[PDB]
Design a binder for this molecule. Structure first.
Ligand SMILES: [Cl-]
Ligand SMILES: [Cl-]
Ligand SMILES: [Cl-]
Ligand SMILES: [Zn+2]
Ligand SMILES: [Zn+2]
Ligand SMILES: [Zn+2]
Ligand SMILES: [Zn+2]
Lengths: 189, 190
């Protein structure tokens, strides 16, 4: 049998791994760094999973942080042009969740909104949770319920595979007030 | 003194003259209002009274199916068939009939979207007594839209243009589909 160095050999992992062992090990490797998970930012930070939240609080002060299982994510200025990201952190149940709203032309010439929640944590940890995103309006409601994505998999892929709440600009306007959009986010465990 | 106008449907029998502010409310519910055929995809020239609409759908549009109850599954078959643009079924509950419409339209060129909406065979005033809920359900995922049913006399077209309905696309559909078919849960409440 042939063995390959771990993905994280450069950051200190000395294990040599067989093809039957390699991906499971790399999910849990103690020498695994995570990139800064904030979308739309040019940040080169690399650190262990339990340092991510501290980094977001110190270096990304535009990201608002709210406490509790049931919050309002107020995305201001939804009529801004081009690709825009709104990011907020929600802290509940001893964990931290990143709430993302992104406006972009995923399909050419069609600006849409994408909303998703990601756990600062592993896939396995994320399976213990579910979340609900709710746009509430004048006799209308639009809801997405799912399992939060892990930082392992990231924001961008979810958006690309429409595995998130997707809505037209017109829909955002049905729910908006004062040029802002309030999104109710509930985390369940 | 106020300004009073005849009903729009004077020529089909209405003798009422109305305060201008009360005119739209009356015209919603006027018994002399002619209704067009509400069936999508059909080049049907039928016109008739509100009380004849469901009958017309049942006898002249025999491919339209009906499900009973306040909580049903609208099974849209072969949703990705090229050229297939309309799926319609009726839901009967609360002494009323609701038209469930799915439309596939490339509103933004190059992006095929699906639009699902519920219409009451009835007036806006009647429609305001109800809420409808549309759900797409999958493996630990649910997309839900809830709103007031549209009156058939307001049509599908304006709802679609304004995205005032459940809106999704082929990618989202794949996440919820069952062998190229899509089950949309529809729950009417009052
Ligand atoms: Cl873009
Ligand atoms: Cl009509
Ligand atoms: Cl038919
Ligand atoms: Zn390792
Ligand atoms: Zn950063
Ligand atoms: Zn009248
Ligand atoms: Zn007809």
């Amino acid at each position: 049998a042939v063995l390959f160095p771990c993905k994280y050999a450069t950051t200190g992992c000395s294990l040599t791994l067989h093809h039957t062992e390699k991906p499971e090990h790399e999910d849990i490797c103690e020498y695994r760094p995570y990139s800064c998970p904030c979308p739309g930012a040019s940040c080169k930070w690399q650190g262990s999973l339990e340092a991510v939240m501290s980094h977001l609080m110190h270096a990304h002060k535009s990201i608002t942080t709210l406490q509790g299982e049931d919050i309002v994510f107020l995305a201001t200025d939804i009529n801004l042009p081009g690709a825009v990201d709104w990011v907020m952190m929600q802290s509940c149940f001893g964990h931290h969740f990143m709430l993302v709203l992104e406006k972009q032309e995923k399909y050419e010439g069609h600006q849409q909104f994408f909303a998703i929640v990601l756990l600062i944590g592993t896939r396995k940890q994320a399976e213990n949770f579910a979340y609900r995103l709710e746009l509430n309006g004048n006799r209308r409601r639009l809801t997405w319920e799912a399992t939060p994505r892990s930082i392992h998999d990231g924001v961008a892929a979810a958006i690309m595979n429409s595995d998130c709440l997707v809505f037209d600009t017109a829909i955002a306007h049905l729910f908006a007030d004062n040029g802002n959009l309030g999104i109710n986010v509930t985390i369940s465990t």
